[PDB]
């Protein structure tokens, strides 16, 4: 007769981190299962991260595009760092286009029906002319850990 | 006695793996040994892994 | 085992025929030789036997060459037939 | 993306009848550990029995 | 950057030739991961020769030890810049300080 | 018209009662084989034999069916009725032609492809001279010994296949050494006819001793 | 003769020209791998032995001895990469070709 876990209280603090709450439990298993769901929870995931990039006039990833004061290489970077959401897909693909001096954040890209950003405020890159755009091609999809470039254009 | 010179650059990006050498700044020198997971890592009372 | 996981259990239709002929690897006058009778998709295309296209002065030449080249890949234009468009798995879900 | 690697116990290699070497294999990158862990704490911290 | 440094950091990338160091200050008119045009304040000024000066980055090239050598801007626009100044940071570089 | 392949028709030394003509498709095909990779499929082997012409340009095919098979090979009457019905049901109309693969290059690679193609007309010719006699009271010689298997080397360029199943059990043969058997297999063996003997049979002794007496 | 840098290859198909444009460089971005051809060049071929096979494309290619052997100067591995920049340098007085 072991007492059960439930789930109590979920504080939402802030909008990126929360506090869930697991009561009632007989001693020991309070670092049993904390280890337990910790360890499961950094380890394997789902989450929506980004694999392809097509910018247009950009042939290979170390080139520079004439009007932006970041390079390719730090465009992807910042395209990384891309906090997406995505409710009904396996992959999809994102389109961006931006004209005008200032910054492209990432609230300018055209958003489908089901693809929803969570960070709005995320700069990518600066555009510095009057005429001088960029217009790129996204690919956001589903996975789980880590897989780099090299193992899998 | 030469015709043309093609001359290619290859741009390789080498990451890091098990065999590299890293250092610090005072003669700490060491072979990187196991590229461990997250979870594996000494974390504190806070939260964050070293 | 048991107990472990007692203490958990309160949280635990061919489709390049419905795609358009525009969509199609060949140059897009051969989807057009399609289009002149208004057919869009490779599915319709299919609806008709190729002889029944053949009927037609709309396609040359070389567009019978691209049908074939369509066709080599067992996609589209081997003979088919469907009530108007949709078959089983074609369904409206 | 949910549909892992899922063991089996390949085999039960023991000696006499109160004791036991038992394998699992093959789990996903780091549980090994963890299911060690767990069934670690349980077994060594909370059973039930009479003595 | 180093967190923990001796403030050497800026004597060795300044005195050294992998930053480009601006020659007379002014105002920058325009960013590029390119270029980078610095307008030359008229209290530094020539009076023939107009004069706003361009800065053309060294971008992804080799070095003698297979490394890549490059330069990144790291000015805004508008923005002030003084005589002595780093605009551009080099190979392990940054803001002017050296990062290795 | 240059009329080398003429007198390069007229070598003749081994293929004179060979098919002379089927030697320039084939070797016509290997000059045209060696380094195309691109092209719609491969090449040829069809091409309209011109005696006179000597370098019989690879043409290719368009093959009148009432079918969907074969997509480059494909006519029906319907599309035949652009040509006003003349085509018929079931012909081998050619309506495409071909060209060549090349140079200094891509011609060692045709050598190497005419080699490859006068060794299958040279497999086909062995065939043949293995179905003319199909089985007889034939000796040879052993020359290599292979896994439960001997391989003997008769007259004329021809070499035979003794299997260790359809041999004596003690009596084991080597290198050197001469016998003499009826052969079973002149028709389907592998790229050819693989002369397989059988020196344990009862008809394999039956001349043996109308040999003697 | 002197040596051709061109793409007409022996003893290559489809797989390995893909990477290459129509006069032999390859492309500037093709991310290549260990063992590719960057650049095609073909005059290796000393002098080896032929046959009766190989006389009989004597004349039907109009090539008197056709060499003796091809194999376009293909190289290693070991190390990926990205084709960043292809420089040219030319002889006066030889044949620009269109890539130069």
Not at chain 4, 28 to 50: D, V
Request: glycine letters at 8%.
């Amino acid at each position: 007769e072991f007492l059960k876990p439930r789930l109590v209280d979920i504080e939402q603090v802030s909008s990126t981190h929360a506090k869930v709450t697991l009561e009632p439990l007989e001693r020991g298993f309070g670092h049993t299962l904390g280890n337990a769901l910790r360890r499961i929870l950094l380890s394997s995931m789902p989450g929506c991260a980004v694999t392809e990039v097509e910018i247009d006039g950009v042939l290979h990833e170390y080139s520079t595009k004439e009007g932006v004061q970041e390079d390719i290489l730090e465009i992807l970077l910042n395209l990384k760092g891309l906090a997406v959401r995505v409710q009904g897909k396996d992959e999809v693909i994102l389109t961006l286009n931006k004209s005008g001096i200032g910054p492209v954040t990432a609230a300018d890209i055209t958003h489908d029906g089901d693809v929803e950003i969570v960070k709005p405020q995320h700069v990518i890159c600066h555009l510095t002319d009057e005429n001088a755009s960029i217009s790129m091609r996204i690919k956001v999809q589903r996975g789980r850990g880590y897989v780099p470039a090299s193992t899998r254009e | 006695g030469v015709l043309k010179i093609v001359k290619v650059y290859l741009a390789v990006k080498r990451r890091i793996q098990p065999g590299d050498k890293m250092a610090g700044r005072h003669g700490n020198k060491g072979v990187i040994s196991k590229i461990n997971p997250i979870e594996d890592m000494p974390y504190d009372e806070n939260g964050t892994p070293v | 085992a048991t107990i472990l996981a007692e203490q958990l259990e309160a949280f635990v239709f061919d489709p390049i025929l419905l795609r358009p002929v525009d969509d199609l690897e060949l140059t897009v006058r051969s989807a057009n030789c399609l289009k002149a009778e208004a057919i869009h998709y490779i599915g319709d295309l299919v609806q008709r036997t190729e002889v029944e296209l053949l009927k037609t002065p709309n396609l040359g030449k070389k567009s019978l060459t691209e049908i074939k080249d369509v066709l080599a890949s067992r996609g589209l234009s081997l003979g088919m037939r469907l009530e108007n468009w949709p078959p089983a798995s074609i369904a409206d879900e | 993306v949910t549909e892992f690697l899922k063991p089996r116990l390949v085999d039960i290699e023991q000696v006499s009848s109160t004791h036991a070497k038992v394998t699992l294999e093959p789990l996903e990158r780091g549980f090994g550990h963890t299911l060690g862990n767990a069934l670690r704490r349980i077994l060594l911290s909370s059973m039930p029995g009479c003595a | 950057k180093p967190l923990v440094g001796t403030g050497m950091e800026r004597a060795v990338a300044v005195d050294s030739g992998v930053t480009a160091v601006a020659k007379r200050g002014g105002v920058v008119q325009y960013v590029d991961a390119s270029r980078i045009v610095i307008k030359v304040n008229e209290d530094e000024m020539y009076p023939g020769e107009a004069g706003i000066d361009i800065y053309n980055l060294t971008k992804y090239t080799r070095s003698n030890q297979n490394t890549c050598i490059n330069q990144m801007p790291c000015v805004s626009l508008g923005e002030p810049v003084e005589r002595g100044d780093v605009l551009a940071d080099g190979p392990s570089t940054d803001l002017g300080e050296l990062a290795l | 018209m240059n009329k080398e392949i003429l007198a390069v028709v007229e070598a003749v030394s081994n293929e004179k009662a060979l098919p002379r003509e089927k030697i320039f498709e084939a070797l016509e095909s290997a000059l045209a084989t060696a380094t195309k990779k691109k092209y719609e499929q491969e090449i040829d082997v069809r091409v309209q034999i011109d005696r006179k012409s000597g370098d019989f340009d690879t043409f290719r095919r368009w093959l009148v069916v009432d079918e969907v098979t074969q997509p480059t090979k494909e006519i029906t009457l319907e599309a035949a009725r652009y040509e006003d019905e003349s085509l018929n049901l079931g012909d081998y109309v050619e309506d495409q032609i071909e060209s060549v693969t090349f140079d200094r290059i891509t011609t060692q690679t045709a050598k190497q492809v005419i080699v490859q193609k006068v060794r299958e007309a040279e497999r086909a010719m062995v065939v043949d001279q293995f179905r003319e006699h199909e089985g007889e009271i034939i000796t040879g010689v052993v020359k290599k010994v292979n896994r439960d298997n001997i391989s003997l080397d008769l007259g004329n360029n021809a070499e035979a296949v003794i299997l260790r199943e359809d041999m004596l059990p003690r009596e084991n043969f080597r290198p050197g050494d001469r016998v003499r058997g009826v052969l079973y297999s002149v028709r389907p063996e592998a790229r050819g006819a693989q002369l397989f003997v059988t020196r344990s049979k009862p008809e394999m002794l039956i001349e043996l001793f109308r040999i003697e007496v | 003769g002197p040596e051709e840098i061109t793409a007409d290859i022996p003893n290559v198909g489809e797989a390995a020209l893909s990477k290459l444009d129509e006069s032999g460089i390859v492309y500037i971005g093709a991310e290549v791998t260990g063992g590719d051809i960057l650049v095609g060049k073909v005059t290796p071929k000393g002098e080896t032995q032929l046959t009766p096979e190989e006389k009989l494309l004597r004349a039907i290619f109009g090539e008197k001895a056709s060499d003796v052997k091809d194999s376009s100067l293909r190289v290693p591995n070991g190390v990926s990469g990205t084709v960043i920049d292809v420089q040219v340098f030319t002889r006066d007085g030889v044949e620009k070709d269109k890539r130069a």
